[PDB]
Structure formats: C-alpha cells, structure tokens
Design a binder for this molecule. Structure first.
Ligand code: 0RE
Lengths: 293, 293
C-alpha cells in the first residue's frame, strides 16, 4: 500500500539503515541527487521535480524517520542523529562519488550536520525555506501587528505534555489545512485531494508524534550546530525562499552567507513557504539549472 | 448557581451595565477596591485576598465579560470597549468618590483605558503580570533556548478559522492544566480539584470563545493605547511580577515607568505568573500595605 502515487519510471522501496527501515522513491540514471522533505509533508512534495531531474541524475526522495512510510529513529530526533540515517542511506547508492542534496523546511535541520561533517561527500547543495538551527531562531517574534507570526508553532510543537498531539488528534486534517494555508501565498495548489493525502499520512499516531519530536529536539540541534558551525561549508550552494506571504524572504540567503563560502540565492515573488507546490515551474527550473552546472 | 464558593460574609450578585449582565462577588465596607482577574481564571483567583481587604475596604471582584458568570460584551473585546463596562460597574458602587484598582493579566488590558481616561476616579493602582498592550508585545520571542516562550499563545489564540476553539473544545481541562503549570514556578498549588473548578467555567462554549476574542482584539487595543499613552498616569501605582518560571520579571516595572509618574515595582522570587495562588502571603501583604497608605 502506497500513501502517495509513484511517478512512472520510479520505484517505491525500503532500505534498513542502522536498524531503521527507511522508505524512499527512486528513479533515473547518473550521479545521485537526494531530495529531503519537511514538516507536514513526505517524499511526495518532490513528485513534480523528480521526473525532470531523473533525465540527468539518479534521484532519491526518502521519507524522514517517523514520517511517511519510514520507521521512527531508534537513536533520536536531533539533527545530528537523524542526519546519520540520511547520510548512510545516500552512501548506499553513491559510495564512490559525492552526491547532490536538496532540502526543504526541516529537511535542512536533518541534513546540515552530515553536510558539514562529510563535505567531500556533497557535490552541490540546495537549501530552501527554513532556518538552519542556530541562535537566529530565538529572534523570531511571537506575535505580529497583522496577527499570527510565522513560527509560533516552534513553541506549540516543542511543548511537553504531548500538547500538540493531544490538541491535534481527531482534527489532523483541519489543523494541517490551516497550517499549510497560513504559510502559503498560492493556496489553490492545495486541493482537497492533496490535503487529504498529506493529512492521512501525518495522522498515523507514530507520525503525528514524530512530527513534533523534531521540534522537541530543536534546542538540542541548536546546541549541536554551535560546535559544527566552526567549520564553514565549501561546496557550491544555492538558497531559495518565497517572497510572498508565508515565505522567509531575504533571511534564507543572509543566514547561509554565515555558513557557506560559495552561495547564490533567489527569492521568488508571489510564492510562500511551500515552494515545490506553490511555484513548481520556476523552482524546478532554478534547481535543475543549478545542479546541471 | 455558583461556579466558585463565595467567601464567608461575601455576596454573589449581578448588575446590568449597558445591556450586559456582569457577575461579581462583593463584601466589606469602606472605600471601594475593584479586583480584576485574567485569562484562564475568574473572580475566584482573588478569594484569599478578599477577606483581608474587606476589613478595610468595600471589595468587588467582577467576572470579565464572557468569562465566569458574566455575559459577553455587546460592543467588542478591545481594551477600550471592555473598560467601559468595568468603569461603569465600579462607579455604580462608588459614584461620589474615587476607587482603587487591582488587575492581573488581561485584567490590565481591560482596565488601562478607563484609568487613563478617568484619572480622577482612580485613587491608587496595582497592576500585575502582563504587558499593557503596546509595541513592546511585538518584541517577545516565539521560541526560547529553554523551550516554549511566554506569549506564543498570543498567536495561537488570535489565529483565524477559530483555530484555538476548534482544537481545545472538549480538551479544556487538559489544556488549562498545561497552560497554568507551564506559566508557574510553584505548580503544587494547582490541585486537580482547583483545576477542575477553573476548567468547568471556561469550558462553557461562550466562555471558551470569549477568552480568545480578547486576543483577537489585542492589535486593536495596541492601536487604541498608542493614542491613550500620550497622557501619563498621575496616581500612585504599584507593579508586581513573578521572578520565577513563567513570570514577567523586570519587564513589568520597566514598561510601567513609561506610563506612570509615581510607580514602585516588585519582583517576587520563586513565583511565576499566578501570583495570588503561587505566592499568596507576600503578594497579599504587598497589595494590602500599598492600598492602606
Ligand atoms: C516557516 C519557515 C520554516 C521553519 C520551520 O522549518 C518550521 O517548521
């Protein structure tokens, strides 16, 4: 049983990594590109980009531990722990060459440590729409003159007593629609069918919990990254962010400038947080061209 | 019926003010002091302080519009709108003499405009444990290096689509225990029995909604107060804040200095947001002494 439909020419498969059964969707030929999703979503956010990339690359899109059809991590949900699973998965398919990495939202949190610790393994890097966990996150405001802020959910999701699971259970589809649309410019791309699919996936009890455990580990991830960031990133890097409602704007590139020597950035007007779906055509073009250099 | 037990020698009654039936508890004799509660609670938070004050004052403790046993406001939930109800209620009992005011949490939001617009009616003022709505509220962080921030709930409660009521309805007792304890230093005073009492009151559907409408009106109150604050407060004022987990600390006094000519402030160590219950002895003493000047 597949939670989401597989594109023609791709296969849905699993690999055991350190005792954890990881789900992924894979297709194409050539050097490896790994695409890593974020919160509220699964591998499927990449389903429009995948067949285009597959003309030039071997493409793998895993479900993050605990999410989609992947088993929860057996170590923990901090960025360093999760990055081990993703790094070892990629290396199963690209043992002798460096691979490319594209990540969105918490996919960034879950890959940054393996990028900085294994720089020779990473040919090119694309990061979109999330802060790397560092002290900058403590400056985002709780409330705005226009209403709810961008990241008040950091506290909601990190709270103890299973606050988020307890309040959201039974209302998973309702909450996810609110959350997605509050962070979107182009809400029309999120059809009832698409929202149904994403909601059913993250509503699995272990997935609903896994979702928030990433946030419960965020402060630990920040502390981890304070040490890791002493080593700058050397590989060619591109950042993308949305310039419309829900987007990170200039923050993405400005933060990345502190981490990478060789970085170019784009802000996409008329697009919010969910770039692969809200602004598929220009986002896909920018990623494809950057990786094809 | 009575949601909370009246202290001996006090009466529970109602007064219609501009078409809205307000509930209050009243006792004692002498000059009038009005005690105004905050979010998650009702007049009952004052029930330990009330007998002591009643030896020297006529004491009234109303339920805020829509909360406890008071009807929702008919105008709106902004600070200026709600303050009219409270000012008129007080002046019914003290038409020819100024009265004293003690306010906690959103009790501050709902009284500040009537204090500034009717300064001669207010003899002495005590404010505790919340910001006066102004530009400073936009500087509070969404997330902290320790975990959930003090006021991330501002965004949760203000969110469109009735997000908060939809998630919290039917889980009111769970939510309130988490909210209260997470804002406390001395959590032990919040017995299951006491939490049962508070939760039953705010679980009334009109009360759960009313609670959040105060936050949906917060930006309006900020705009209102930008004009009002052009006139400084002239009457003797005292601020209190908790110095422990969940408390406002030095912020309370520092903000009040911008608003008042004559102000003294105290931070109570080992006490969080819920001063009358967490630290009844020192808080009650500070209030009684200040008013008895
Ligand atoms: C909305 C910007 C991205 C920040 C985090 O990844 C939120 O889940």
């Amino acid at each position: 049983a597949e939670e989401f439909p597989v594109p023609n020419g791709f296969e849905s498969a699993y690999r055991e990594v350190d005792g954890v059964k990881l789900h992924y969707v894979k297709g194409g030929q050539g050097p490896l590109v790994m695409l890593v999703h974020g919160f509220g979503q699964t591998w499927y956010e990449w389903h429009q980009l995948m067949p285009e990339l597959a003309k030039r690359f071997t493409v793998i899109a895993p479900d993050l531990p605990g999410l989609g059809q992947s088993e929860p991590p057996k170590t923990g949900y901090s960025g360093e722990q999760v990055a081990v699973y993703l790094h070892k998965l990629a290396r199963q398919f690209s043992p002798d060459r460096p691979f490319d990495l594209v990540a969105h939202d918490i996919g960034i949190w879950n890959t940054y440590p393996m990028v900085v610790k294994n720089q020779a393994d990473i040919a090119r890097l694309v990061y979109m729409e999330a802060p790397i966990p560092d002290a900058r996150i403590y400056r985002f405001p709780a409330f705005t003159a226009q209403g709810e802020s961008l990241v008040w959910h950091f506290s909601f999701f990190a709270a103890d007593d299973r606050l988020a699971e307890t309040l959201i259970a039974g209302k998973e589809r309702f909450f996810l629609e609110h959350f997605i649309k509050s962070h979107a410019s182009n809400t029309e791309v999120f059809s009832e069918r698409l929202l149904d699919l994403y909601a059913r996936s993250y509503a699995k009890p272990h997935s609903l919990n896994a979702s928030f455990e990433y946030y419960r580990a965020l402060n630990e991830s920040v502390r981890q990254n304070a040490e890791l960031a002493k080593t700058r990133l050397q590989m060619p890097t591109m950042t993308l962010a949305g310039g419309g409602h829900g987007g990170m704007g200039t923050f993405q590139l400005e933060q990345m400038k502190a981490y990478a020597e060789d970085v170019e950035g784009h802000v996409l007007p008329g697009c919010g947080h969910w770039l692969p779906e809200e602004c598929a055509a220009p986002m896909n073009r920018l990623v494809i061209d950057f990786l094809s250099r």
